[PDB]
């Protein structure tokens, strides 16, 4: 996985743009699992 290393902030616009790029690169099956993991991480830090 050649993911870029974000080091500034993840706001609503950034997460929406990041997901769209993941669908194009990895597909909807990979991104569906990424969404499940990011959902837990966001809930766990809130």
């Amino acid at each position: 996985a050649n993911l870029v290393f974000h080091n500034k902030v993840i706001d609503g616009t950034a997460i929406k743009r990041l997901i769209s790029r993941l669908i194009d690169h990895f597909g909807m099956a990979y991104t569906s699992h990424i969404l499940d993991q990011v959902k837990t991480l966001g809930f766990q830090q809130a």
Binding site: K39, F43, Q44
Partner: protein, 63 residues
């Protein structure tokens, strides 16, 4: 007990001491908790259950 005309004698349902009493005073925090209060969901404790804090009687009629 001496009573004046127009003074309370008994309390009915949802009435305590001559006041409207529709609810309960419960300890409450305002924070997100693991998504179980996502949108408008409410996370409660078992104390409200086994303490009968929000227990209500419901009567149906069959004719």
């Amino acid at each position: 007990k001496c009573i004046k005309k127009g003074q309370i004698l008994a309390d009915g349902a949802a009435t305590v001491g001559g006041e409207l009493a529709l609810g309960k005073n419960v300890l409450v925090a305002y924070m997100p908790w693991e998504g179980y209060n996502f949108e408008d969901a409410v996370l409660i404790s078992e104390c409200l259950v086994y303490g009968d804090i929000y227990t209500s009687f419901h009567i149906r009629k069959y004719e």
